Design a binder for this molecule. Sequence first.
Ligand SMILES: O=C1C(=O)N(C(c2ccccc2)c2ccccc2)[C@H]2CNC[C@@H]2N1C(c1ccccc1)c1ccccc1
Ligand SMILES: [Cl-]
Ligand SMILES: [Cl-]
Ligand SMILES: [Cl-]
Lengths: 99, 99
Amino acid sequence: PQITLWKRPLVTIKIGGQLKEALLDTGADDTVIEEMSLPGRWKPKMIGGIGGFIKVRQYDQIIIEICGHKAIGTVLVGPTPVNIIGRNLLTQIGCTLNF
Amino acid sequence: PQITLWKRPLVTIKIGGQLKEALLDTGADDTVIEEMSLPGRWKPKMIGGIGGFIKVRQYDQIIIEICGHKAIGTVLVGPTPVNIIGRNLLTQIGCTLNF
Ligand SMILES: O=C1C(=O)N(C(c2ccccc2)c2ccccc2)[C@H]2CNC[C@@H]2N1C(c1ccccc1)c1ccccc1
Ligand SMILES: [Cl-]
Ligand SMILES: [Cl-]
Ligand SMILES: [Cl-]
């Protein structure tokens, strides 16, 4: 699809058997999801943005389905106010910026 | 152009005759630039970042060139890790997400 930017580019994602609403975020290096459980090993990580840093759990090799496109990558889990799909997964679904 | 997302989508912008670097940021509602001098009156604005809420200075009707494209719109001045061009100006230059 072609998604305009008059409003937040929110899409439905499927992660760890759950459906969530997430933002397609070209300004985010990483994908950050609100608190949930995911299987496998994790390690703590600190990520910083507007308003400072938050502590997250880093899970690697996690499959997500984004608008019907499946991708795999690292997912960070922690107190983000909005679920964010960052560049590490946007590349995998072939998402580009065009003007 | 078409900008892929394997690297950060950093571009040159021009504001007040000076070149700066900024991220094309679809996850940002607003455009947020690090402390600099802008003309005119400003008013207060609170934005909710990933790390929490911050107060910034809102300047309206600011002339800004982004990757060669002229925009005239709202710029917020405040502590951000990287200058970010948000949806308010991405729409002005005709930017869409595509996959
Ligand atoms: O406020 C931010 C924000 O903090 N970031 C961070 C960031 C860091 C790490 C992971 C994800 C996000 C950031 C990254 C690079 C440069 C500057 C800041 C922004 C990345 N792209 C948009 C994101 N917005 C949004 C936002 C989105 C969801 C929930 C809260 C905030 C934003 C920015 C400005 C105005 C409105 C929303
Ligand atoms: Cl990854
Ligand atoms: Cl590609
Ligand atoms: Cl504007």
